[PDB]
Amino acid sequence: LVLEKRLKRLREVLEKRQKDLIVFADNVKNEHNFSAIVRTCDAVGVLYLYYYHAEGKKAKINEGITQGSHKWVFIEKVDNPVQKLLEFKNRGFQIVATWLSKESVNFREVDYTKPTVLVVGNELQGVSPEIVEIADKKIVIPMYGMAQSLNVSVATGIILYEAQRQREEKGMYSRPSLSEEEIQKILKKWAYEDVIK
């Protein structure tokens, strides 16, 4: 019966998932920050998290820091960021990238309620120059101190919660963006993958 409870809870979670709000982690340095980002994705309703990492990208999530959240977000390793992002762009997704530059706009000026792929990272200016070249929006978070930037996980949460606020205002968490077919498919899949190993 206990397992029924988790699936019940999984269903409620899937009914609030934003199949439309995608996150792309561009070369996030340490696993502690990566795990925190996974937790944050889960918190705002992000269902898909893609990532690109040094030497292949064999990312090891910390269960003690993810609290098991790594289980209800699809995490997919990508070998070519621009190629993957172009796939979303051609599908109508706006590519929003954190780019540390005076030419970038305040992150609150973006409309996160439309299909969006938020790209964050630990390259010199946030995302790589290769990625920013294809972005629709280049964003920064206002700073008033000596630090030029914020910890990548903290910045990701700040931006994603602005997205949460906007979507909440439009009632996008009040109705499922995933269809019942998709919800049932995921329930079955994860209930299966959770056991098998």
PDB file of C-alpha atoms in Angstrom:
ATOM      1  CA  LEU A   1       0.000   0.000   0.000  1.00  0.00           C
ATOM      2  CA  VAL A   2       2.918   2.317   0.766  1.00  0.00           C
ATOM      3  CA  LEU A   3       4.091   2.152  -2.844  1.00  0.00           C
ATOM      4  CA  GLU A   4       0.580   3.253  -3.830  1.00  0.00           C
ATOM      5  CA  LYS A   5       1.083   6.433  -1.813  1.00  0.00           C
ATOM      6  CA  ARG A   6       4.283   7.397  -3.629  1.00  0.00           C
ATOM      7  CA  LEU A   7       2.618   6.779  -6.999  1.00  0.00           C
ATOM      8  CA  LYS A   8      -0.368   8.805  -5.818  1.00  0.00           C
ATOM      9  CA  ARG A   9       2.006  11.611  -4.900  1.00  0.00           C
ATOM     10  CA  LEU A  10       3.885  11.169  -8.176  1.00  0.00           C
ATOM     11  CA  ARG A  11       0.600  11.656 -10.016  1.00  0.00           C
ATOM     12  CA  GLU A  12      -0.125  14.917  -8.185  1.00  0.00           C
ATOM     13  CA  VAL A  13       3.389  16.067  -9.035  1.00  0.00           C
ATOM     14  CA  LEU A  14       3.006  15.112 -12.694  1.00  0.00           C
ATOM     15  CA  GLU A  15      -0.268  17.058 -12.830  1.00  0.00           C
ATOM     16  CA  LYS A  16       1.663  20.242 -12.004  1.00  0.00           C
ATOM     17  CA  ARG A  17       4.720  19.576 -14.179  1.00  0.00           C
ATOM     18  CA  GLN A  18       5.515  22.235 -16.798  1.00  0.00           C
ATOM     19  CA  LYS A  19       6.397  20.091 -19.825  1.00  0.00           C
ATOM     20  CA  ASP A  20       7.113  23.424 -21.478  1.00  0.00           C
ATOM     21  CA  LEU A  21       9.778  24.804 -19.103  1.00  0.00           C
ATOM     22  CA  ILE A  22      13.127  23.157 -19.912  1.00  0.00           C
ATOM     23  CA  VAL A  23      16.460  23.610 -18.153  1.00  0.00           C
ATOM     24  CA  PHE A  24      19.883  23.040 -19.711  1.00  0.00           C
ATOM     25  CA  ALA A  25      22.915  22.880 -17.399  1.00  0.00           C
ATOM     26  CA  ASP A  26      25.982  23.934 -19.348  1.00  0.00           C
ATOM     27  CA  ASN A  27      29.099  22.468 -17.773  1.00  0.00           C
ATOM     28  CA  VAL A  28      28.126  22.833 -14.110  1.00  0.00           C
ATOM     29  CA  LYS A  29      31.317  22.289 -12.108  1.00  0.00           C
ATOM     30  CA  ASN A  30      30.599  20.332  -8.919  1.00  0.00           C
ATOM     31  CA  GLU A  31      27.971  17.745  -8.075  1.00  0.00           C
ATOM     32  CA  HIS A  32      26.724  19.653  -5.029  1.00  0.00           C
ATOM     33  CA  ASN A  33      25.603  22.523  -7.267  1.00  0.00           C
ATOM     34  CA  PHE A  34      24.244  20.101  -9.851  1.00  0.00           C
ATOM     35  CA  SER A  35      22.201  18.194  -7.248  1.00  0.00           C
ATOM     36  CA  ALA A  36      20.846  21.460  -5.867  1.00  0.00           C
ATOM     37  CA  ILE A  37      19.772  22.425  -9.388  1.00  0.00           C
ATOM     38  CA  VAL A  38      17.959  19.103  -9.773  1.00  0.00           C
ATOM     39  CA  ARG A  39      16.107  19.785  -6.510  1.00  0.00           C
ATOM     40  CA  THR A  40      15.180  23.271  -7.723  1.00  0.00           C
ATOM     41  CA  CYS A  41      13.896  21.930 -11.054  1.00  0.00           C
ATOM     42  CA  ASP A  42      11.665  19.510  -9.155  1.00  0.00           C
ATOM     43  CA  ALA A  43      10.413  22.350  -6.939  1.00  0.00           C
ATOM     44  CA  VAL A  44       9.184  24.587  -9.763  1.00  0.00           C
ATOM     45  CA  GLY A  45       7.688  21.866 -11.904  1.00  0.00           C
ATOM     46  CA  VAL A  46      10.483  21.324 -14.399  1.00  0.00           C
ATOM     47  CA  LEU A  47      10.207  17.887 -15.998  1.00  0.00           C
ATOM     48  CA  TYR A  48      13.212  17.900 -18.343  1.00  0.00           C
ATOM     49  CA  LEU A  49      16.795  18.763 -17.371  1.00  0.00           C
ATOM     50  CA  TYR A  50      19.524  18.362 -20.001  1.00  0.00           C
ATOM     51  CA  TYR A  51      23.216  18.745 -19.263  1.00  0.00           C
ATOM     52  CA  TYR A  52      26.613  18.958 -20.949  1.00  0.00           C
ATOM     53  CA  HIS A  53      29.742  18.148 -18.952  1.00  0.00           C
ATOM     54  CA  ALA A  54      33.524  17.849 -19.279  1.00  0.00           C
ATOM     55  CA  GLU A  55      34.995  14.526 -20.436  1.00  0.00           C
ATOM     56  CA  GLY A  56      31.830  12.907 -21.719  1.00  0.00           C
ATOM     57  CA  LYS A  57      29.615  14.118 -18.851  1.00  0.00           C
ATOM     58  CA  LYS A  58      29.155  11.166 -16.494  1.00  0.00           C
ATOM     59  CA  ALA A  59      27.332  13.176 -13.820  1.00  0.00           C
ATOM     60  CA  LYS A  60      26.987  11.606 -10.371  1.00  0.00           C
ATOM     61  CA  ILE A  61      24.056  13.010  -8.391  1.00  0.00           C
ATOM     62  CA  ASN A  62      24.217  12.998  -4.590  1.00  0.00           C
ATOM     63  CA  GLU A  63      21.136  11.293  -3.146  1.00  0.00           C
ATOM     64  CA  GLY A  64      21.834  13.006   0.166  1.00  0.00           C
ATOM     65  CA  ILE A  65      21.624  16.444  -1.449  1.00  0.00           C
ATOM     66  CA  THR A  66      18.934  15.680  -4.032  1.00  0.00           C
ATOM     67  CA  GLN A  67      16.771  14.013  -1.375  1.00  0.00           C
ATOM     68  CA  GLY A  68      15.642  11.588  -4.065  1.00  0.00           C
ATOM     69  CA  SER A  69      14.263  14.378  -6.249  1.00  0.00           C
ATOM     70  CA  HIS A  70      16.598  13.204  -9.019  1.00  0.00           C
ATOM     71  CA  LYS A  71      13.960  10.512  -9.498  1.00  0.00           C
ATOM     72  CA  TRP A  72      11.067  12.663 -10.727  1.00  0.00           C
ATOM     73  CA  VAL A  73      12.911  14.821 -13.264  1.00  0.00           C
ATOM     74  CA  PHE A  74      14.182  13.398 -16.574  1.00  0.00           C
ATOM     75  CA  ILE A  75      17.919  14.067 -16.667  1.00  0.00           C
ATOM     76  CA  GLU A  76      19.555  13.648 -20.080  1.00  0.00           C
ATOM     77  CA  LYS A  77      23.224  14.024 -21.001  1.00  0.00           C
ATOM     78  CA  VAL A  78      23.891  15.879 -24.274  1.00  0.00           C
ATOM     79  CA  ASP A  79      27.125  15.722 -26.308  1.00  0.00           C
ATOM     80  CA  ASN A  80      26.469  18.809 -28.420  1.00  0.00           C
ATOM     81  CA  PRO A  81      24.689  21.756 -26.692  1.00  0.00           C
ATOM     82  CA  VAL A  82      24.064  23.940 -29.735  1.00  0.00           C
ATOM     83  CA  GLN A  83      22.651  21.022 -31.722  1.00  0.00           C
ATOM     84  CA  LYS A  84      20.245  20.075 -28.937  1.00  0.00           C
ATOM     85  CA  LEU A  85      19.233  23.672 -28.272  1.00  0.00           C
ATOM     86  CA  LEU A  86      18.626  24.198 -31.995  1.00  0.00           C
ATOM     87  CA  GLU A  87      16.208  21.273 -31.914  1.00  0.00           C
ATOM     88  CA  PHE A  88      14.148  23.075 -29.288  1.00  0.00           C
ATOM     89  CA  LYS A  89      14.495  26.437 -31.003  1.00  0.00           C
ATOM     90  CA  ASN A  90      13.189  25.062 -34.302  1.00  0.00           C
ATOM     91  CA  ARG A  91      10.304  23.603 -32.277  1.00  0.00           C
ATOM     92  CA  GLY A  92       9.258  27.059 -31.108  1.00  0.00           C
ATOM     93  CA  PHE A  93      11.146  27.221 -27.807  1.00  0.00           C
ATOM     94  CA  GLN A  94      12.833  30.499 -26.885  1.00  0.00           C
ATOM     95  CA  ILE A  95      16.411  29.948 -25.726  1.00  0.00           C
ATOM     96  CA  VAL A  96      17.169  32.035 -22.627  1.00  0.00           C
ATOM     97  CA  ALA A  97      20.816  32.036 -21.555  1.00  0.00           C
ATOM     98  CA  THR A  98      22.656  33.536 -18.599  1.00  0.00           C
ATOM     99  CA  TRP A  99      25.375  35.679 -20.181  1.00  0.00           C
ATOM    100  CA  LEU A 100      27.535  37.953 -18.023  1.00  0.00           C
ATOM    101  CA  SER A 101      27.633  41.079 -20.156  1.00  0.00           C
ATOM    102  CA  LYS A 102      26.442  44.684 -20.051  1.00  0.00           C
ATOM    103  CA  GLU A 103      24.494  43.891 -23.227  1.00  0.00           C
ATOM    104  CA  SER A 104      22.336  41.327 -21.408  1.00  0.00           C
ATOM    105  CA  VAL A 105      18.921  42.211 -20.009  1.00  0.00           C
ATOM    106  CA  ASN A 106      17.494  41.947 -16.493  1.00  0.00           C
ATOM    107  CA  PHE A 107      16.196  38.370 -16.104  1.00  0.00           C
ATOM    108  CA  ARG A 108      12.734  39.647 -15.149  1.00  0.00           C
ATOM    109  CA  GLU A 109      12.202  41.120 -18.628  1.00  0.00           C
ATOM    110  CA  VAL A 110      11.786  37.675 -20.180  1.00  0.00           C
ATOM    111  CA  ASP A 111       8.375  36.028 -20.594  1.00  0.00           C
ATOM    112  CA  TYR A 112       8.872  32.556 -19.088  1.00  0.00           C
ATOM    113  CA  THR A 113       5.245  31.500 -19.674  1.00  0.00           C
ATOM    114  CA  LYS A 114       5.902  30.541 -23.306  1.00  0.00           C
ATOM    115  CA  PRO A 115       7.849  27.388 -24.314  1.00  0.00           C
ATOM    116  CA  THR A 116      11.285  28.098 -22.866  1.00  0.00           C
ATOM    117  CA  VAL A 117      14.665  26.441 -22.421  1.00  0.00           C
ATOM    118  CA  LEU A 118      16.621  28.145 -19.619  1.00  0.00           C
ATOM    119  CA  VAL A 119      20.370  27.618 -20.062  1.00  0.00           C
ATOM    120  CA  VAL A 120      22.649  28.123 -17.051  1.00  0.00           C
ATOM    121  CA  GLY A 121      26.274  27.186 -16.530  1.00  0.00           C
ATOM    122  CA  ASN A 122      29.745  27.622 -15.090  1.00  0.00           C
ATOM    123  CA  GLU A 123      31.643  28.858 -18.140  1.00  0.00           C
ATOM    124  CA  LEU A 124      33.429  32.217 -17.870  1.00  0.00           C
ATOM    125  CA  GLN A 125      30.329  34.291 -18.654  1.00  0.00           C
ATOM    126  CA  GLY A 126      27.715  31.712 -17.662  1.00  0.00           C
ATOM    127  CA  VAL A 127      27.052  29.718 -20.807  1.00  0.00           C
ATOM    128  CA  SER A 128      29.662  29.176 -23.515  1.00  0.00           C
ATOM    129  CA  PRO A 129      30.024  31.594 -26.440  1.00  0.00           C
ATOM    130  CA  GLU A 130      28.861  28.759 -28.708  1.00  0.00           C
ATOM    131  CA  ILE A 131      25.570  28.590 -26.825  1.00  0.00           C
ATOM    132  CA  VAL A 132      24.958  32.319 -26.424  1.00  0.00           C
ATOM    133  CA  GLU A 133      25.308  32.680 -30.206  1.00  0.00           C
ATOM    134  CA  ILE A 134      21.990  30.876 -30.692  1.00  0.00           C
ATOM    135  CA  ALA A 135      20.124  32.348 -27.706  1.00  0.00           C
ATOM    136  CA  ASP A 136      16.932  34.386 -28.119  1.00  0.00           C
ATOM    137  CA  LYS A 137      17.492  36.151 -24.802  1.00  0.00           C
ATOM    138  CA  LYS A 138      20.721  36.909 -22.920  1.00  0.00           C
ATOM    139  CA  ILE A 139      20.073  37.527 -19.223  1.00  0.00           C
ATOM    140  CA  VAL A 140      21.782  38.688 -16.051  1.00  0.00           C
ATOM    141  CA  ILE A 141      20.702  39.000 -12.435  1.00  0.00           C
ATOM    142  CA  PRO A 142      21.255  42.480 -10.922  1.00  0.00           C
ATOM    143  CA  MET A 143      24.267  42.692  -8.582  1.00  0.00           C
ATOM    144  CA  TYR A 144      25.130  45.451  -6.109  1.00  0.00           C
ATOM    145  CA  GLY A 145      28.288  44.163  -4.411  1.00  0.00           C
ATOM    146  CA  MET A 146      31.853  43.110  -5.179  1.00  0.00           C
ATOM    147  CA  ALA A 147      30.951  39.704  -6.605  1.00  0.00           C
ATOM    148  CA  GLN A 148      30.476  39.732 -10.374  1.00  0.00           C
ATOM    149  CA  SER A 149      28.149  36.723 -10.325  1.00  0.00           C
ATOM    150  CA  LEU A 150      26.186  34.370  -8.069  1.00  0.00           C
ATOM    151  CA  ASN A 151      26.682  30.671  -7.314  1.00  0.00           C
ATOM    152  CA  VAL A 152      25.184  28.878 -10.361  1.00  0.00           C
ATOM    153  CA  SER A 153      22.662  26.919  -8.263  1.00  0.00           C
ATOM    154  CA  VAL A 154      21.437  30.043  -6.491  1.00  0.00           C
ATOM    155  CA  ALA A 155      21.089  31.943  -9.783  1.00  0.00           C
ATOM    156  CA  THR A 156      19.190  29.025 -11.291  1.00  0.00           C
ATOM    157  CA  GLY A 157      16.722  29.065  -8.417  1.00  0.00           C
ATOM    158  CA  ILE A 158      16.244  32.834  -8.621  1.00  0.00           C
ATOM    159  CA  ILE A 159      15.511  32.713 -12.340  1.00  0.00           C
ATOM    160  CA  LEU A 160      13.317  29.613 -12.171  1.00  0.00           C
ATOM    161  CA  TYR A 161      11.230  31.170  -9.420  1.00  0.00           C
ATOM    162  CA  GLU A 162      10.611  34.267 -11.509  1.00  0.00           C
ATOM    163  CA  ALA A 163       9.379  31.768 -14.113  1.00  0.00           C
ATOM    164  CA  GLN A 164       7.275  30.127 -11.386  1.00  0.00           C
ATOM    165  CA  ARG A 165       5.745  33.462 -10.402  1.00  0.00           C
ATOM    166  CA  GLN A 166       4.792  34.305 -13.984  1.00  0.00           C
ATOM    167  CA  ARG A 167       3.307  30.873 -14.706  1.00  0.00           C
ATOM    168  CA  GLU A 168       1.517  30.810 -11.365  1.00  0.00           C
ATOM    169  CA  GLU A 169      -0.117  34.135 -12.230  1.00  0.00           C
ATOM    170  CA  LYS A 170      -1.532  32.623 -15.432  1.00  0.00           C
ATOM    171  CA  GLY A 171      -2.794  29.561 -13.582  1.00  0.00           C
ATOM    172  CA  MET A 172      -0.366  27.281 -15.407  1.00  0.00           C
ATOM    173  CA  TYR A 173       0.045  25.124 -12.301  1.00  0.00           C
ATOM    174  CA  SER A 174      -3.724  24.786 -11.891  1.00  0.00           C
ATOM    175  CA  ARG A 175      -4.193  22.541 -14.935  1.00  0.00           C
ATOM    176  CA  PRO A 176      -1.960  19.675 -16.186  1.00  0.00           C
ATOM    177  CA  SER A 177       0.205  20.496 -19.213  1.00  0.00           C
ATOM    178  CA  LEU A 178       0.803  16.752 -19.612  1.00  0.00           C
ATOM    179  CA  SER A 179      -2.049  14.675 -21.052  1.00  0.00           C
ATOM    180  CA  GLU A 180      -3.433  11.671 -19.175  1.00  0.00           C
ATOM    181  CA  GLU A 181      -1.718   9.377 -21.713  1.00  0.00           C
ATOM    182  CA  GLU A 182       1.633  11.002 -20.954  1.00  0.00           C
ATOM    183  CA  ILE A 183       1.010  10.947 -17.205  1.00  0.00           C
ATOM    184  CA  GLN A 184       0.134   7.254 -17.251  1.00  0.00           C
ATOM    185  CA  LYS A 185       3.171   6.489 -19.402  1.00  0.00           C
ATOM    186  CA  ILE A 186       5.488   8.212 -16.943  1.00  0.00           C
ATOM    187  CA  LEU A 187       3.820   6.634 -13.899  1.00  0.00           C
ATOM    188  CA  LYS A 188       4.295   3.185 -15.410  1.00  0.00           C
ATOM    189  CA  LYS A 189       7.859   3.885 -16.533  1.00  0.00           C
ATOM    190  CA  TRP A 190       9.136   5.380 -13.287  1.00  0.00           C
ATOM    191  CA  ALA A 191       7.340   2.826 -11.131  1.00  0.00           C
ATOM    192  CA  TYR A 192       9.191   0.246 -13.228  1.00  0.00           C
ATOM    193  CA  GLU A 193      12.606   1.935 -13.308  1.00  0.00           C
ATOM    194  CA  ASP A 194      12.352   2.635  -9.571  1.00  0.00           C
ATOM    195  CA  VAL A 195      12.285  -1.109  -8.926  1.00  0.00           C
ATOM    196  CA  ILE A 196      14.560  -2.546 -11.621  1.00  0.00           C
ATOM    197  CA  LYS A 197      18.286  -1.804 -11.316  1.00  0.00           C
TER     198      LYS A 197
END
